Amino acid sequence: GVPICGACRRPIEGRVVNAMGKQWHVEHFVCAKCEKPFLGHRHYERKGLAYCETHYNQLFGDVCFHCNRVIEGDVVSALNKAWCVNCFACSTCNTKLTLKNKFVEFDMKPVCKKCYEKFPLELKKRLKKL
Amino acid sequence: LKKLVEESREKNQPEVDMSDRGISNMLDVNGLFTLSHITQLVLSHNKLTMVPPNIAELKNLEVLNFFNNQIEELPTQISSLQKLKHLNLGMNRLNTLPRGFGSLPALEVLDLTYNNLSENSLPGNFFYLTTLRALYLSDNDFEILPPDIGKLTKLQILSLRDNDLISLPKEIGELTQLKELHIQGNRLTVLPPELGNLDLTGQKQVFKAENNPWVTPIADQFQLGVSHVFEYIRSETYKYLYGRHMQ
Ligand SMILES: [Zn+2]
Ligand SMILES: [Zn+2]
Ligand SMILES: [Zn+2]
Ligand SMILES: [Zn+2]
Numbered sequence: 001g002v003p004i005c006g007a008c009r010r011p012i013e014g015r016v017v018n019a020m021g022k023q024w025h026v027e028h029f030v031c032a033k034c035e036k037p038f039l040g041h042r043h044y045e046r047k048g049l050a051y052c053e054t055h056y057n058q059l060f061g062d063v064c065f066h067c068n069r070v071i072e073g074d075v076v077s078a079l080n081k082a083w084c085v086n087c088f089a090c091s092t093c094n095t096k097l098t099l100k101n102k103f104v105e106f107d108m109k110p111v112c113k114k115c116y117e118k119f120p121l122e123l124k125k126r127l128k129k130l
Numbered sequence: 131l132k133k134l135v136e137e138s139r140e141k142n143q144p145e146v147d148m149s150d151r152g153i154s155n156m157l158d159v160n161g162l163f164t165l166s167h168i169t170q171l172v173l174s175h176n177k178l179t180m181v182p183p184n185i186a187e188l189k190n191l192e193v194l195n196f197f198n199n200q201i202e203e204l205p206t207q208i209s210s211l212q213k214l215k216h217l218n219l220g221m222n223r224l225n226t227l228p229r230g231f232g233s234l235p236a237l238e239v240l241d242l243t244y245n246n247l248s249e250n251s252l253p254g255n256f257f258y259l260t261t262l263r264a265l266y267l268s269d270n271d272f273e274i275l276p277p278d279i280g281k282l283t284k285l286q287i288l289s290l291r292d293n294d295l296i297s298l299p300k301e302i303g304e305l306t307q308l309k310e311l312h313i314q315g316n317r318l319t320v321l322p323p324e325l326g327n328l329d330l331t332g333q334k335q336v337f338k339a340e341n342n343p344w345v346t347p348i349a350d351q352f353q354l355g356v357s358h359v360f361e362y363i364r365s366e367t368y369k370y371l372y373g374r375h376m377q
Contacts, residue, residue, distance in 0.1 A: 066216075068215075068238060068263070080309075080310075080333075080334045080335070080336060091218075091241075092174055092195075092197045092198070092218070092220065093149045093150075093172060093174050093175070093195070093197070094147070094149075094170065094172050094174075094193065094195055095147075095149075107243065107266060107268055107289050107291065107312060108287075108310060108312075108336060115174075115175075115197075118175055118198060119221075120221075120244075123244065123269070126292075130314065130340070130341075
């Protein structure tokens with residue numbers, strides 16, 4: 001027989017939305033955050049739920065460790081964290097960095113080579129053994 | 131130094147970098163405290179022993195970095211910075227923080243690594259800093275972490291590496307946002323079961339706990355992996371043994 005909607009469990013006689021392994025009425029297939037129907041617009045999926053682009057990025061987009069905002073544009077990934085390209089910088093002198101720089105990991109923060117050299121010897125000796 | 135101040139006011143540069151310039155006194159930096167427009171000030175790797183109350187005049191500061199000086203105390207005015215989000219006091223000589231330090235309304239990252247702080251160093255209102263998402267207390271002298279640590283509900287990162295902790299407060303279990311817990315190099319023997327309310331087994335998460343005199347079953351579970359550790363401290367067996375270990 002004809003498809004049945006996944007949200008209201010009723011037969012779909014007219015136009016059918018095919019998404020996430022289910023069939024939907026156009027009005028009943030909506031974003032999980034805001035209750036707004038996609039109406040043809042691209043949807044984004046996450047854990048069996050559909051979201052609009054703006055709310056998808058807000059809930060699941062990478063957040064910058066420095067400016068604490070959802071990153072727009074390219075992401076710098078390092079040390080289990082993420083930075084905006086223009087935010088990535090040394091944690092001890094704030095000089096901007098790229099992944100092409102030789103920085104060290106210090107309590108899971110990036111520290112530039114020049115800064116690390118200035119650390120106390122007793123600390124550097126302990127960090128090597130760790 | 132008189133050219134990094136003049137050019138910052140002429141071209142309206144919000145970021146001032148005076149790292150490693152042999153500065154022994156901020157009041158000696160000509161015109162520094164007239165730059166009310168700046169949002170970032172870096173004074174790391176200098177020779178500062180103090181911070182003057184004039185710091186309050188830089189009212190738009192969002193980033194303030196004093197890493198690796200010899201600062202021994204801070205003025206109360208440090209907490210009047212309404213826009214301050216990042217404060218690096220790492221590698222100094224602090225054994226106290228000033229009255230009302232916890233009044234900073236927007237502070238997100240606080241770095242106190244490598245000083246001489248203990249629980250007694252913290253002002254009564256320290257844990258009013260509820261906007262904090264990262265707190266670094268590595269290389270200090272904490273024996274006890276106050277239970278009010280639980281008031282810091284947005285905390286994602288907590289480092290207590292290389293302190294003198296004999297115990298972890300169960301209130302750490304209330305930190306539902308926590309992603310990183312660094313507790314290497316203390317004097318911990320057991321973990322509170324309430325820590326199991328947290329899950330730090332994720333790929334993006336960190337749980338570092340080496341170099342503690344853990345009781346044998348906990349040390350054994352570490353050798354198997356973080357998943358095993360958290361499974362264990364959630365178990366009825368651990369709860370039974372923990373209750374008897376305390377009494
Ligand atoms: Zn329907
Ligand atoms: Zn939406
Ligand atoms: Zn950013
Ligand atoms: Zn650096």
